[PDB]
């Protein structure tokens, strides 16, 4: 089997992508956000402190005739910004894009943070990193790609991020129309339950490109490109006026700039990050001052390749026996 779903930026800046999924019977349709950095299933639902909606679309699984409450089981993430949610599970039936899983763990969320209540665009969230950082207790549960891993023409999904444009997420199939040249293939280590991989270095503009070794994840679920402080460094020093501000709490650039692009390695392979995509857009309405979407890893532990950095290629996250993941440009 297969599936392909387009998946929608959120806003102007690209600050998250949904994707619509069909959650029970009948379908009640939720826009999710597909992150390879987590692997938890939850969604807003009729069991959500009603002061914590505030205009998110509910899973009510008093109304899916196959939904079935999983005895004792609870729920419990915080996400890397500090946002968090908790509550009961459910198994359903769950479809993207014309791909479906019985069974699937719903987890009903009863308590979400004030960074999700006002983000009303996002219904919840589909993990897609590996099944041993689900947080279900006291029976730890499958991510939706895992469920449907054998059952698929190939045990692969992809992510085609757009700039501020619409993408695409695959399950079981790459299109071979989707990108240019070749798909570059890398090593990774699912030790710490992520898309962990080294990419070859980097580049800034029309630089040298320097071969280092940069140990990141592969994070649909973050919006920003977060590397070693000595190359964050070495892409703002190339943008006139641009300064790391404490108060704002990371790079700023003045909006009347022209930012270089940023080009990562994979392998002896090349991603171009344009420079546009490096913009994150006025640090609050009315300012000239600007946000950039490179920042500083040094407070986080890891480096993440989020999706200013994904949307520049064509990614294919290979789970056989031994996961890889693949890059093309497009
Ligand atoms: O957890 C790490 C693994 N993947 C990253 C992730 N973080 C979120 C997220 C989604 C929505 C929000 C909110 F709406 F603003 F509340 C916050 C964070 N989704 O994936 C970071």
Known sequence: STGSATTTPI??????????????????????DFDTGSSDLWVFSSETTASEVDGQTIYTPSKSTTAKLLSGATWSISYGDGSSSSGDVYTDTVSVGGLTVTGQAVESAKKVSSSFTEDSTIDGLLGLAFSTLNTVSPTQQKTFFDNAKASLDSPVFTADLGYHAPGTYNFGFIDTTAYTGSITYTAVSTKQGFWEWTSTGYAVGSGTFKSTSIDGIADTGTTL???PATVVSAYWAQVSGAKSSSSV???????????????????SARIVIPGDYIDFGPISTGSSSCFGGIQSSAGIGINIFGDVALKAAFVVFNGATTPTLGFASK
Do not use: K
């Open 225 to 227: 490109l977060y590397l």
């Open 249 to 267: 709490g990371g790079y700023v650039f003045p909006c009347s700039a022209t930012l270089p692009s940023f080009t990562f390695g994979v392998g």
């Open 11 to 32: 806003d102007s800046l690209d600050d998250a992508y949904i994707t619509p999924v069909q959650i029970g019977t009948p379908a009640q349709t939720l826009n999710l």
